[model samples]
Target: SKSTAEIRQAFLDFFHSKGHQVVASSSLVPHNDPTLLFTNAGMNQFKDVFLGLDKRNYSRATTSQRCVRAGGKHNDLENVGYTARHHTFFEMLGNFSFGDYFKLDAILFAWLLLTSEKWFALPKERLWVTVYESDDEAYEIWEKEVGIPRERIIRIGDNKGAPYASDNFWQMGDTGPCGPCTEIFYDHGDHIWGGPPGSPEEDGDRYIEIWNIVFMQFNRQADGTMEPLPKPSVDTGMGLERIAAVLQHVNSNYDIDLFRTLIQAVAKVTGATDLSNKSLRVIADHIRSCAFLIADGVMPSNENRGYVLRRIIRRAVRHGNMLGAKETFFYKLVGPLIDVMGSAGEDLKRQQAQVEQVLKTEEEQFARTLERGLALLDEELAKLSGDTLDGETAFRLYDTYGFPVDLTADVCRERNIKVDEAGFEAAMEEQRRRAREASGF
Candidate 1:
């Protein structure tokens, strides 16, 4: 019913009632550490604590951790648009036990949260758990100890989907505390998608992961061998915004109170109230992402983090333009976003002036660039006698004028000119391969 903060507090309170010390978030590590480029999981901060290298003030601890994965290590940009659950910057609610509590407590806590009306209020039948297919101990715990039926339990064989490697396995890094993990998923009922509850892939949007119970049982050696940890620990991450979305009975995170205000602010600023549903969704998602990135010390540049931010802003602006918004409309949306979410993220508030200035400048520059791109696209279309636009021309628009392939396609569609989708993709792939080869990827 409340915001993500309330749900986060409830999780911490629930853990505290069970005697876990609630702690503050750890600082984002600087420089490259082989285990991670950025802190991907909540357990990252407690690696030393789990390894006994740092003093454990308490065996059990709880915290709402701040994590980023845009550029390095946990780079998940490709997965973000494709999946309903993945995010670049997210809050991981976790409770850690440094050899204090093991699998049973972890399973029971997860079970209680899902079943308890005071918490998630989810039904047992709607719940599903995943275990390392080979983890007999964890499998038995879910089946017997937690009373999760065998049919409801999904077992992942090998390391691809449930591997012990970075993909499926849970490790603090190249070294320190690590182990296998079990995750709890919630079926959002078939009313939304009109699909069966069986397939995890098809019904991913339906069956959202509410919590993860990572069993930190081993220490990963530098040479890639697992050494048994004396005290096996537990680390968990529950999505705050995700939980709020479910609890609030909203279909999308943007619909929840946490982000609705920001979305409304965007709608008001762009004067694109008559925009289509897809356009609105793009605006909301991109604006929040852009605001967060700019707040986190990223500038609007042509490379890396800046490139991501630039792309996001440009995409949102392009959508705004499609929705009948005039020039420089997106820059106005940033202020309202800062008004809504700036408090929770101090970096956003602190960099408000800079963010606004950069966005304003970028918007002005992009307007001129977009006009030139349109002019070039028109010329290219005129040059086309009968055939669709060529890959070379499309690439020129993309490379020279920053016109996205999709935008080009949209423009072509408006003019009744068929786009060479196949050629476009071929050219795009060739260019990407060449860039990769040049960069020695």
Candidate 2:
């Protein structure tokens, strides 16, 4: 079995062997890009390159980028423990061709990387491909050239903005470097629940998309029209942990070697007995984002990235309390996390002491109010006859006890109680209005 470290290196090595420069991963913090909260994709570092702004000596590059999607529209913080693949922090293994190769070549490269005996060697029969609805070129490449039968290739459209739709069209935003993309999905086996990418059951965990090959052939402008780029480029991304899970024969990303070790560390610190405990998994997942965010210079605070980090730290502490931990336990897992992350952890290890200190301080601060907050929540629940937690109670927890509304909602969700989210928003607005009036505005 390939270790997670081995799989990551093999990707860079395979690309490097094909004349792709193995680029170092950039900071989680997007350099000079305030439009993005954190580096959410591998293409982020090369955005300027695609836009004809920045130039590198090499045309092709490969990288294992450190990404955080806990904030902004890409936020997956709330989905971490409930799902198999969702994570706030994960490494994106990517290869870039800036004004070099186009669709067919990129597709061939991806297919070879996955199916070649010398590389990952994933089974061909279990693989599935998806292309943009109108992308006949991609469909032909997979069916005619790659020899993946037509049935195995799924044509996915925008689907009229339908829920959980797999959009095969890739765009940097509403504008710029937009084009059709082809995604590669691997069937874990019939034992899992999902169908292929476009099927109704596609959202299930059965068929996991391991790679997305995006062709940057068009530039969408302010007027909502597409223009052909002078040089069409290729940008491809595959989640390192997702691929690791496939290679390691695990159904969930949390079951991979790296996470297995991290979870063990969490259990050691929190004295958790059930290895499958969802809260333990949540803590294990949060530690990566929290530690990496801190190492990248984002601190726990009240606004923006800091607030995101603070919320995650608080969430992890709350989970620890659920596990019956009485002392500061979240910070102690930093050392174990460093060990599990292999080469990627080196940067984090540089700031290990500081990371631990920041986490400990944040945990202690939250600990002061967590108990009182939960007590208030329990009292509210005790007095309630309904299944839904009231908006005022949720708002009080958020305003007075430092609970993020989602945190309060998380507790409510466990007992099959739903949070009155719209009412919560209404209460919050009323408070703002009162504040404005009190200030004589």
Candidate 3:
């Protein structure tokens, strides 16, 4: 019933009505934290306040933060085109408490905003919740206080040293303000495939975690001990695009109102006939991340932030080629992006000329090498009877021809094969060692 912009504004305004300061979205690049590769979360700007190292005039705040999760150079190009919810760039709508509140208020506010007729008005029966394994306080709040059925709430524990497992325990880092989190999930219906949060098949896209409310109540020490924080705080994040998908009655994040328009634009520019083409989705996704990164003052280069930008740009360009794009077309989508973004695109709109110029130049430059690299990649694929592409070939593509490892993996993914990522890393490490020895360090 509402547009994405309206949904974002409603969330901020709801928090504002609750006496929370409506803070503007921070830059994609973090302000003072070097430990983070990018501003990956809404609480990044308030790290100091939670640690009691700095103070804010207000105790409560809300923001729709811009976040990038491509993870520096080793970007995950595999997930974007295929998944219903993954994206390199997405808006994180969040509400925070510096020291004024804890789990009860946070739970009540979230429950009201999500289920109230005046707010998102999400259906009650379709929703599920997950609490920290030992957090009976939160469990009671959801089951008894919030009137959610006990069967709908699941208790999740910290990953037992497993990578990417469902973990309800929240920690700022190895040692800092940390505590349990309660997450709210929405079932998109039985049409999709997946289980609940802690289930064996939980990785499926059927059940999506829409909001995560972290109750920061402990201070983890370097000596592997936890102490209760003097002032427990609350931090919550809800993905705008994911919620938009649920509200728009679509399953994929790429099928929402904003991305539908962007995908149409991609189809127009690339002359793609099939609207459901995965390559078109990749192009649409890349335009946002690339344009926003450039607008934030990151340029294409060989290292760090610039390197990540270059990888994404090239991936988009390759996807364009996959879609039969006649010429440099990625830059043209910036106009439509500006339009779909509404007032949020003001920053990008201001730097329109520069952003387009940067994209066009990078696209043109990469255009030259992309064809040759793809050809070589095809040649290598033909020679290999085995499914996996070796690290040497992948590394050569990176070292000699400038194909980012992720891009190489993208091609292999279509063939139902995988790139030898460990071998690629070993080759890369060997190069670094040679460089170090050459420099006599």
Candidate 4:
């Protein structure tokens, strides 16, 4: 029954009551980091503390972070439209400990907060959990300490005798503070799957994972070795959008309360009946991400952070095109984005002018560079027949008409065809020489 804002505040306040200092979220762009283009996780600000390289006076902290997951250029498959739960941007509600606590308390705190009548009060039987395969301590905690039904819990790791990625292992990247993790999933009921919990054939879409608590107790080395962290810590992230969906009784993350405003605004602008429109969903999702990034001072351009922004900007534009949206129409989405998510930070308010201008320029440019590639795109899709679209054709789409490789690729993907990006990039390099000479822009 609570709005998304109230839910966010409730989680933070709950943690604050537990003696955790409530820390305001850091920027979507981190303060000092060269390795990343945008902040992608709640724990990013505390990477140094986890490594024991930096210390905070307070050991426990809580925050709700703004994260962007739009992969840089070449990772076209990362778009949010393809799934029920993916998003280019989402809020991460989290509680953290820097060498202050470990598994038992974390598990108990999470279970109580989510299922207790005083808090989330989610159904106890419906809450299922998974933990590290070898972590008996965590397994016992879930089964005995928390009183979860035995069948409701499963432990997964790299398959036995197989060297593989840990399903329950938590690692930020190639190397850093890493350890085992425990995740809690909520059963949305048997409506979609028509089966009981933990069924392999069940629609994975039927159950939603809402919370993840990580035990960051190891220092992973460059050579793939693991060492005990001097100050093994705890890091957890729960997707606020997903939680809002669960609390609001909606199936899709985009269908949540605050997201409804932008989705509805997009539907109105594009003449859609509702947010059920896939193109409308895409537009709403990307615009939310775009407003945040632009507010954080990232501009749309051809390289690095800008390139990533450019890709998503064009992705939003093409989705707009798919919705029959007029050129520059998506610039209006900034208003709703600011309206709903404005409370996330002061930056959204302070940088309002800059955000809209960046959005306008990108939309305007994309609107100009893009043309009616519908027939051409369909022809290419026909040729591919669900295979990779070759570089030359993608290049022709890019150079000859400026039909963005972005739009081209996204269109291909929506149709289940792949774009030959390696070839596409090659074409860009060679043809830019010719393209600039001919177009003379």
Candidate 3 structure quality by residue, lDDT tens digits, 233-285: 99999999999998988889998999989999999999999987789899898
Q: How well does candidate 4 match the true structure in TM-score terms?
A: 0.91
How far in Å is the alpha carbon of 105 misplaced in model 2? 1.3
Candidate 4 C-alpha lDDT tens digits along 48-149 = 899999989999999999888766311323546656667888889999999898899999889888988999998887788888888899999999898888
Worst 10 residues of 1 by lDDT: 194-203
Task: Give the runs in model 2 whose Cα sits over 4 Å from its true position.
Answer: 160-166, 221-224
Evaluated against the true structure, the overall lDDT of model 4 is 0.79
Kindly provide the TM-score of model 1 when superposed on the true structure, using C-alpha atoms.
Answer: 0.79
**Which prediction has more favorable lDDT, 1 or 3?**
3
In order, candidate lDDTs are 0.70, 0.89, 0.88, 0.79
Candidate 3 residues lying further than 4 Å off, grouped into runs, are 72-77, 160-166, 221-224, 432-441
Q: What's the TM-score of every candidate structure?
A: 0.79, 0.96, 0.95, 0.91
Better of 1 and 2 by lDDT: 2
Model 2 global lDDT (CA atoms, 0 to 1): 0.89
Best by lDDT: 2
Q: Where does candidate 1 stray beyond 4 Å?
A: 26-39, 69-86, 159-168, 171-177, 192-203, 219-223, 274-276, 338-343, 374-395, 403-441
Candidate 3 lDDT trough over 10 residues, lowest sum: 158-167
User: Where does candidate 4 stray beyond 4 Å?
Assistant: 72-79, 159-164, 193-203, 379-388, 402-406, 425-441
